[PDB]
Amino acid sequence: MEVNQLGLIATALFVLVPSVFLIILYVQTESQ
Amino acid sequence: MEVNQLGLIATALFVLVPSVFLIILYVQTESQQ
Amino acid sequence: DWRVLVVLLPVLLAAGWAVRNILPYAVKQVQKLL
Amino acid sequence: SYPIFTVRWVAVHTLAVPTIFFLGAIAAMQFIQR
Amino acid sequence: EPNPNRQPVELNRTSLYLGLLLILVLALLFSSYFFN
Amino acid sequence: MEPNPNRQPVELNRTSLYLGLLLILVLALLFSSYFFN
Amino acid sequence: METITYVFIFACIIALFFFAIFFREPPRIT
Amino acid sequence: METITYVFIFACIIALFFFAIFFREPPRIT
Amino acid sequence: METLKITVYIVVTFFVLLFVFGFLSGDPARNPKRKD
Amino acid sequence: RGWFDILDDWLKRDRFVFVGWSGILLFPCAYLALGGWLTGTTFVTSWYTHGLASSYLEGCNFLTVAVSTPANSMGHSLLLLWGPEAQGDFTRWCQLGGLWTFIALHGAFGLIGFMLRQFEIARLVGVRPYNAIAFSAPIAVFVSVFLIYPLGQSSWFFAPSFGVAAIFRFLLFFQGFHNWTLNPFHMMGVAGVLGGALLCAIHGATVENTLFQDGEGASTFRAFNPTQAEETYSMVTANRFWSQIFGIAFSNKRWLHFFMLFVPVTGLWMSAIGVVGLALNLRSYDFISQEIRAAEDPEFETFYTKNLLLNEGIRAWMAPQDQPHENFVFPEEVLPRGNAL
Amino acid sequence: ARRTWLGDILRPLNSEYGKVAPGWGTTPLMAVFMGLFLVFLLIILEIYNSTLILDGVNVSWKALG
Amino acid sequence: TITPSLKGFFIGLLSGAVVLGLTFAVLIAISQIDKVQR
Amino acid sequence: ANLWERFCNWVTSTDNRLYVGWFGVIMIPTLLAATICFVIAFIAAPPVDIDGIREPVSGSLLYGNNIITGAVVPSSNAIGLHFYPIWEAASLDEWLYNGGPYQLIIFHFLLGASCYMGRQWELSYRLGMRPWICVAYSAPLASAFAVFLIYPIGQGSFSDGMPLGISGTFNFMIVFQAEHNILMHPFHQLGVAGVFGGALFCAMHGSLVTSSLIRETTETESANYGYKFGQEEETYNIVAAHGYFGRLIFQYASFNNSRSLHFFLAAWPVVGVWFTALGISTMAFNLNGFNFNHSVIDAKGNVINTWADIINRANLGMEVMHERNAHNFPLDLA
Amino acid sequence: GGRIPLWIVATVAGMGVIVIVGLFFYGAYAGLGSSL
Amino acid sequence: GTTGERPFSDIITSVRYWVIHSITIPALFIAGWLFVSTGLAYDVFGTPRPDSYYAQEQRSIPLVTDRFEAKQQVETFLEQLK
Numbered sequence A: 001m002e003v004n005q006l007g008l009i010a011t012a013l014f015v016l017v018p019s020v021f022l023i024i025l026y027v028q029t030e031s032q
Numbered sequence B: 001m002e003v004n005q006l007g008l009i010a011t012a013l014f015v016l017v018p019s020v021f022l023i024i025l026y027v028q029t030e031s032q033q
Numbered sequence C: 001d002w003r004v005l006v007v008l009l010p011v012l013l014a015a016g017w018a019v020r021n022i023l024p025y026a027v028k029q030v031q032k033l034l
Numbered sequence D: 001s002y003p004i005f006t007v008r009w010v011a012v013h014t015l016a017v018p019t020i021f022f023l024g025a026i027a028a029m030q031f032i033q034r
Numbered sequence E: 001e002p003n004p005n006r007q008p009v010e011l012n013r014t015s016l017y018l019g020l021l022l023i024l025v026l027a028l029l030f031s032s033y034f035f036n
Numbered sequence F: 001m002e003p004n005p006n007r008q009p010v011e012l013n014r015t016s017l018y019l020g021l022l023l024i025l026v027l028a029l030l031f032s033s034y035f036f037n
Numbered sequence G, H: 001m002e003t004i005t006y007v008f009i010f011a012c013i014i015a016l017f018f019f020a021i022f023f024r025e026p027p028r029i030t
Numbered sequence I: 001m002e003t004l005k006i007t008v009y010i011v012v013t014f015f016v017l018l019f020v021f022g023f024l025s026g027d028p029a030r031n032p033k034r035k036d
Numbered sequence J: 001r002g003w004f005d006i007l008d009d010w011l012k013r014d015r016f017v018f019v020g021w022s023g024i025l026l027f028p029c030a031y032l033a034l035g036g037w038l039t040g041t042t043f044v045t046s047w048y049t050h051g052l053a054s055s056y057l058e059g060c061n062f063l064t065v066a067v068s069t070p071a072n073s074m075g076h077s078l079l080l081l082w083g084p085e086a087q088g089d090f091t092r093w094c095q096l097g098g099l100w101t102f103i104a105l106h107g108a109f110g111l112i113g114f115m116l117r118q119f120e121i122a123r124l125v126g127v128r129p130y131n132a133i134a135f136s137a138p139i140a141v142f143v144s145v146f147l148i149y150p151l152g153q154s155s156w157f158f159a160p161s162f163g164v165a166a167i168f169r170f171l172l173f174f175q176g177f178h179n180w181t182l183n184p185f186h187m188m189g190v191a192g193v194l195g196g197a198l199l200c201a202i203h204g205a206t207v208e209n210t211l212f213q214d215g216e217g218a219s220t221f222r223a224f225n226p227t228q229a230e231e232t233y234s235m236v237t238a239n240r241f242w243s244q245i246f247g248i249a250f251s252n253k254r255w256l257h258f259f260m261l262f263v264p265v266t267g268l269w270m271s272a273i274g275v276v277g278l279a280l281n282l283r284s285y286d287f288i289s290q291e292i293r294a295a296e297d298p299e300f301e302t303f304y305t306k307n308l309l310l311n312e313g314i315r316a317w318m319a320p321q322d323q324p325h326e327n328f329v330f331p332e333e334v335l336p337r338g339n340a341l
Numbered sequence K: 001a002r003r004t005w006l007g008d009i010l011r012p013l014n015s016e017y018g019k020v021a022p023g024w025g026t027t028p029l030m031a032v033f034m035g036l037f038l039v040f041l042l043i044i045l046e047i048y049n050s051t052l053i054l055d056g057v058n059v060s061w062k063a064l065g
Numbered sequence L: 001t002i003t004p005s006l007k008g009f010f011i012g013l014l015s016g017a018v019v020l021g022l023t024f025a026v027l028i029a030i031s032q033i034d035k036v037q038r
Numbered sequence M: 001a002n003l004w005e006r007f008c009n010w011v012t013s014t015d016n017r018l019y020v021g022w023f024g025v026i027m028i029p030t031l032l033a034a035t036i037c038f039v040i041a042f043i044a045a046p047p048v049d050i051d052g053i054r055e056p057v058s059g060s061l062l063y064g065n066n067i068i069t070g071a072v073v074p075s076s077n078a079i080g081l082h083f084y085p086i087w088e089a090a091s092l093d094e095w096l097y098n099g100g101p102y103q104l105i106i107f108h109f110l111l112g113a114s115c116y117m118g119r120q121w122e123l124s125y126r127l128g129m130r131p132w133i134c135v136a137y138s139a140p141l142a143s144a145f146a147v148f149l150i151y152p153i154g155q156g157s158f159s160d161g162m163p164l165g166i167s168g169t170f171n172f173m174i175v176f177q178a179e180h181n182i183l184m185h186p187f188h189q190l191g192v193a194g195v196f197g198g199a200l201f202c203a204m205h206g207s208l209v210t211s212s213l214i215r216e217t218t219e220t221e222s223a224n225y226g227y228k229f230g231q232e233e234e235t236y237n238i239v240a241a242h243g244y245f246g247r248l249i250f251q252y253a254s255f256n257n258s259r260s261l262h263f264f265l266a267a268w269p270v271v272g273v274w275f276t277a278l279g280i281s282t283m284a285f286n287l288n289g290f291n292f293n294h295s296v297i298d299a300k301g302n303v304i305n306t307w308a309d310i311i312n313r314a315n316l317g318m319e320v321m322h323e324r325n326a327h328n329f330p331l332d333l334a
Numbered sequence N: 001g002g003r004i005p006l007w008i009v010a011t012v013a014g015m016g017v018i019v020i021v022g023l024f025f026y027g028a029y030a031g032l033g034s035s036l
Numbered sequence O: 001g002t003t004g005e006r007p008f009s010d011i012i013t014s015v016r017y018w019v020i021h022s023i024t025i026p027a028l029f030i031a032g033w034l035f036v037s038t039g040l041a042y043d044v045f046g047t048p049r050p051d052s053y054y055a056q057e058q059r060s061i062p063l064v065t066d067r068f069e070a071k072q073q074v075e076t077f078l079e080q081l082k
């Protein structure tokens, strides 16, 4: 299927960047 | 130039995953103090 | 062949000469080993 | 009273004896002609 | 000379679970449109 | 049942963060050309 | 690559369900 | 896309230099 | 191009004069022990 | 109080040259590797394996003598003296290249010996075994280059030959055939070796120029005593200098000295990995995107294409005499050459 | 610590921690088998290497017929 | 049957045994004579 | 309150986060110029006719390079050793075609690096240190002078100076080998011994000190926390480390004077790198590596090749191929 | 014990090296390996 | 400080030392010399003499091209000089 090649990076970053934000916030919450 | 299309994501993850790992550990070290 | 003793003669003579000059104190050392 | 024949004695002569012999062989070589 | 306005920030574990769920479901919804 | 006695805190000081980010960025800079090829 | 991507995200969600249920913040009575 | 990537990484390294220098852990004596 | 040339001559001259005059302004004396 | 403990007692006596249990392996093997090299470079030819003179006896000097690899037709034969190739004849053994395997293999077990010795002495003296750990890099380099690399190739013939100029030829072979300068594992090795030498010089220079005045002499070496408690140079002043000069400085003496271990050891390990790749001809030879463009666009030129033209010259001008078993005959008209030269 | 049925059954197999046979025990016998195993590996290596050639042992792909 | 290379193998193997045993015989000898005083 | 004296006080202040100083008054602008021009040219400069033959070589990212292949390309052989500032070009277009940026960058950089070395002297004096760290830096500095200025002066062209790029560097070192046989030159051999040895002794020293650290910590903490910045006591035990290394070799091959030791560490690589910089600087005037080409012949007169003749076959293939369109006459005399 | 003084042993050893290495460089120009 | 061996600087300034070694050192030098001057070094190691790299009207290298016949091949080449 001739899908958009940038679709992968866009989906990958879409998940990763905000998920990592939350994980950072959460781990430093537990360690205090 | 006709470059390997997957080079971008390989490079993005190569940078992002190990950096994010270090940032996570740094920030929770700071909040211990 | 003959070239082997020619080469080897100075080595024996040399070790013979050392054996005779040192022997007195080599005897002593060995005795001190109990 | 020092010993004469030691492990040190052997290490030394294990290197020095062939070295001088090899230096002699190599000096002769400077006089080989083609 | 430390600034007195600094505050710590918090994300509890339930908020992490809710947040990760929001992002993953958004990714699942929008990914088909990104690939087109 | 007791909670686990073997748990420990982990640390990464700020200097180790800088050193590690530098390592990763330089590695990326070096290898990226081979990934694009 | 898009099939893999869709299945991946779905699989992550199922794992989140597991942790959300079995490793919740236990609710307690203060 | 590859030019953008190369320059982006180099730019991050320069920004890191700035924080490494001016926002280091200050060395404190004894 | 000449505006450029002249601008660079002046910039370079200015900096080289700072350098010469700075090291002539008592530099041996700017140390933490014996100042003269 | 049996024989094993008595022998242990004796191997571990404090003497001018410590022996140890590791000495049993080390000292025979080191002395034989080293004697094989000296013997071969003084007396032994490479005429039948390489078509090369390679000993002082033949007219070579210190830069051109070598113990050269066996003929390609030996494959990876261990070339034991008593094996089916030399059949116990010492002279033919020398002529077939048996001294190369002799030196390589005794050399490898000597290197093991030596690292066991660093372990053995470290344990007796009561210190941590980091010197041994560091020496793992030299071992990785030796085995990957002298053993793993020729084992992936057709024969020991393409291993490095033990000689100054011979190793230069190995450098140039790797350029022309493997484009090894383009290999990022070599590049990390370059950074670790050049980073090591930098760190060595800059650390020495710093200690020597932040010395404490601890004597009255113009020679500052006298004013040190190995059992003094006090640091002999100022880490505080050193740290200030470099912070102001370079932006950042070491502040932890322990990290400093660990990093001096870390940097060159890691670089050597990285270069070993890339050589393992080259054992398989798994080269970082090309960039595909560059080749596609250049094939279509004859005005497109980079230092990358210019270097492959040089490689292609290296291969065609050196292969006939460097790989004689292949009987390459390149008529003049097929040699790549630019204008005039 | 928690006891479990399976734990109670396996208990005897993790109950002799620290127990040694005195002195050198079987070490000389271990040494013998070490020695045999080395010669055994030597033979195997040298056959693969074609340093040891044996009647009827053709170390080639053509030993599949 | 015992091919020439199997013969060399044993030659190689006996020589190693000799060199190794000879080595250890000498080392045990000397260690016995020149003991540490405790 | 005097204005000049206040400015002098700030230039030479030891309270600035980065020391400026009189050497810095020249270093700061020259290095900023060289850096800004380098980055712009690496990313966007158009192809440069390095060898003067109207055969332009593309060095920048936007013109189809990656990090490994990219370079600021040396200035045109048509220019030779002529000074080629911007204001000597009829336009920026011309200046870019002919390699002007290379000259701007290397002259600014060599000046700024020279001043970097002086700045190292200067702050040492303001801090009351001993002065010779800069002498250590003169080794890398002399090496950059050799490949950017000296070798061009002797060969007559900045087009034979070292490209400012990764593959460009390798091109320079392959061509150097074909034209000078640098590997058979003893000053490059001392350079290899300086750099190999420096890495050896770096690892040695780091491993011996790390090996004799005094237990100050538990197994759950980095040992690095056993040393506190500015403590007076040494943090390792040099006598235990001397006693380990003296036994690994023999006693009198080991240092127990820490001053002698660190001087050894300073001097070995610095001196090796002096020699290899001097190697490039003297191969600039074509005093080349040893030539044993056909030095061994037999009783009849047949040539008996050695490993040097094999090196020569490789050197030939580099020679005949390099700058393949640039030679009209049979000897590459420069 | 300490009869033959050390400086004299150093000088004689020293010249003995100079002589051997001298002969080795002389042989670079004579005989085998001299290109002639 | 010391492990009880006699110091080297004591040994080499001692008269007995040089009494032995003024004989042993030259004798070894002359032995190595004779090893070469007699031609014995050539024959032990198989190194070609200047007149025996090639045969008179030959310019092929006598290169070993067989593993298990290699010893025989060298002998063949060597006969082609006799």
Ligand code: CLA
Pocket (backbone or CB within 6 Å): J024, J025, J028, J029, J032, J078, J079, J080, J081, J082, J098, J101, J102, J103, J105, J106, J109, K035, K039, L012, L013, L014, L015, L016, L017, L019
């Ligand atoms: C610790 C010392 C040491 C080590 C590790 C080695 C290792 C090696 N040597 Mg070196 N060598 C040594 C000392 C050593 N050598 C010494 C001291 C000398 C001078 C005498 C030599 C001279 C030498 C030569 C001349 C050659 C080697 C070769 C070799 C290789 C082959 C060895 C082999 O196949 O052995 C096989 C034997 C063994 C592994 C010994 C095993 C014995 C076991 C433990 C017992 C088995 C039972 C026994 C046989 C029972 C007796 C039966 C009898 C009653 C009939 C190997 C790399 C060869 C080489 O380098 O090839 C290129 C070669 O040609 N060595």
Ligand code: CLA
Pocket (backbone or CB within 6 Å): J034, J137, J138, J139, J140, J141, J142, J144, J145, J170, J171, J172, J174, J175, J179, J180, J181, J186, J188, J189, J190, J193, J194, J267, J268, J271, J272, J273, J275, M173, M195, M196
């Ligand atoms: C800026 C220039 C530069 C630098 C710094 C390096 C740096 C390096 N190169 Mg690269 N190289 C370069 C340019 C450069 N290279 C170029 C232009 C080429 C051409 C393509 C190459 C081609 C090249 C090849 C072909 C190889 C390297 C290798 C290496 C590594 C060598 C490691 C080492 O010390 O091995 C030295 C050897 C050891 C450390 C092994 C063991 C040594 C033992 C302990 C010896 C003990 C001696 C004993 C006591 C007896 C001594 C006595 C005797 C001397 C008389 C290192 C990362 C090697 C590599 O990557 O290996 C993995 C390798 O094979 N280089």
Ligand SMILES: C=Cc1c(C)c2cc3nc(c4c5[nH]c(cc6nc(cc1[nH]2)C(C)=C6CC)c(C)c5C(=O)[C@@H]4C(=O)OC)[C@@H](CCC(=O)OC/C=C(\C)CCC[C@H](C)CCC[C@H](C)CCCC(C)C)[C@@H]3C
Pocket (backbone or CB within 6 Å): J029, J030, J033, J034, J037, J103, J104, J107, J108, J109, J110, J111, J114, J131, J134, J135, J137, J138, J142, J161, J162, J163, J164, J167, J193, J196, J264, J265, J268, M196, M199, M200, M201, M203, M204, M207, M248
């Ligand atoms: C060419 C470069 C080079 C050489 C010559 C070299 C040499 C040495 N390094 C040693 C050590 C070290 N090397 C270290 C790090 C490094 N070493 C490096 C590079 C080298 N290291 C690099 C780059 C590093 C940085 C990671 C450490 C950390 C150590 C040590 O602790 C140790 C030491 O004590 O240093 C003072 C010594 C080990 C002595 C030994 O094993 O004796 C026994 C001798 C044996 C076993 C013989 C081996 C024979 C070899 C393998 C094959 C034959 C070689 C021929 C005889 C000669 C060939 C010559 C031609 C090729 C030209 C020895 C002086």
Ligand SMILES: CC(C)=CCC/C(C)=C/CC/C(C)=C\CC/C(C)=C/CC/C(C)=C/CC/C(C)=C/CC/C(C)=C/CC/C(C)=C\CC/C(C)=C/CC1=CC(=O)C(C)=C(C)C1=O
Pocket (backbone or CB within 6 Å): D010, D011, D012, D014, J027, J028, J030, J031, J034, M201, M204, M205, M206, M208, M209, M238, M241, M242, M245, M246, M249, M253, M254, M255, M256, M261, M264
């Ligand atoms: C027919 C028959 C049977 C034949 C006979 C064959 C036969 C039987 C053989 C067997 C013979 C036998 C049994 C054995 C005896 C053989 C024998 C003696 C073997 C010789 C082996 C040999 C080749 C040994 C290798 C020699 C070796 C490589 C030594 C080199 C020395 C060397 C270069 C050392 C480096 C030292 C240096 C100059 C500087 C110091 C390094 C450095 C700066 C370290 C940093 C540092 C140092 C400190 O010091 C401390 C404190 C600290 C803090 C610190 O940072």
Ligand SMILES: CCCCCCCCCCCCCCCC(=O)OC[C@H](COP(=O)(O)OC[C@@H](O)CO)OC(=O)CCCCCCCCCCCCCCC
Pocket (backbone or CB within 6 Å): F013, F015, F016, F018, F019, F022, F026, H010, H013, H016, H017, H020, H021, J245, J246, J247, J248, J249, J250, J251, J252, J253, J255, J256, J259, M018, M224
């Ligand atoms: C005139 C101005 C001078 C120009 C300044 C330029 C800044 C350059 C310095 C680097 C800043 C980043 C340091 C990182 C991280 C940093 O902050 O670490 C700081 C660190 C502090 O060490 P301490 O001893 O304080 O740390 C001990 C403990 O904290 C251990 O956890 O120092 C070192 O480790 C130095 C050794 C690494 C030195 C690495 C330098 C390599 C630089 C080259 C990178 C080039 C790649 C470029 C490719 C594009």
Ligand SMILES: CCCCCCCCCCCCCCCC(=O)OC[C@H](COP(=O)(O)OC[C@@H](O)CO)OC(=O)CCCCCCCCCCCCCCC
Pocket (backbone or CB within 6 Å): D011, D012, J017, M248, M249, M250, M251, M252, M253, M254, M255, M256, O006, O007, O008, O009, O010
């Ligand atoms: C340039 C690099 C080296 C820098 C210099 C070294 C540091 C100097 C030493 C510090 C204290 C002494 C100051 C000067 C004093 C000093 O250094 O004198 C050198 C030393 C003098 O010792 P003596 O025993 O003669 O006497 C003790 C004297 O120190 C008192 O005058 O002599 C030797 O070491 C002889 C060397 C040949 C030894 C042959 C060894 C056999 C080789 C065996 C194989 C090696 C082992 C294998 C390894 C695996």
Ligand SMILES: CC1=C(/C=C/C(C)=C/C=C/C(C)=C/C=C/C=C(C)/C=C/C=C(C)/C=C/C2=C(C)CCCC2(C)C)C(C)(C)CCC1
Pocket (backbone or CB within 6 Å): D014, D015, D018, D019, D020, D022, D023, J031, J032, J034, J035, J036, J037, J038, J039, N017, N021
């Ligand atoms: C192989 C073999 C073997 C062994 C052998 C041996 C072990 C040998 C040894 C040998 C030896 C052991 C040798 C030696 C030699 C030496 C030499 C050859 C030296 C020289 C040196 C020099 C030349 C130097 C000089 C100098 C200079 C140049 C400068 C600086 C200073 C000086 C003075 C140092 C056997 C029998 C087992 C059998 C099998 C085979």
Ligand SMILES: CCCCCCCCCCCCCCCCCC(=O)O
Pocket (backbone or CB within 6 Å): J081, J082, J083, J087, J088, J089, L007, L008, L011, L012, L015, L016, L017, L019, L020
């Ligand atoms: C582990 C230690 C191993 C020691 C190996 C030392 C080997 C000693 C060398 C003996 C070589 C004799 C071979 C010559 C006779 C062979 C004749 C034949 O092939 O039938």
Ligand code: OEX
Pocket (backbone or CB within 6 Å): M051, M155, M159, M160, M175, M179, M322, M323, M326, M332, M333, M334
């Ligand atoms: O430019 Mn660069 O390179 Ca020194 O030679 Mn002539 O020129 Mn070119 O050719 Mn070869």
Ligand SMILES: [Cl-]
Pocket (backbone or CB within 6 Å): J306, M171, M175, M321, M322, M323, M324
């Ligand atoms: Cl070119």
Ligand SMILES: [Cl-]
Pocket (backbone or CB within 6 Å): M326, M327, M328, M329
């Ligand atoms: Cl021309």
Ligand SMILES: [Fe+2]
Pocket (backbone or CB within 6 Å): J203, J257, M205, M209, M262
């Ligand atoms: Fe240090």
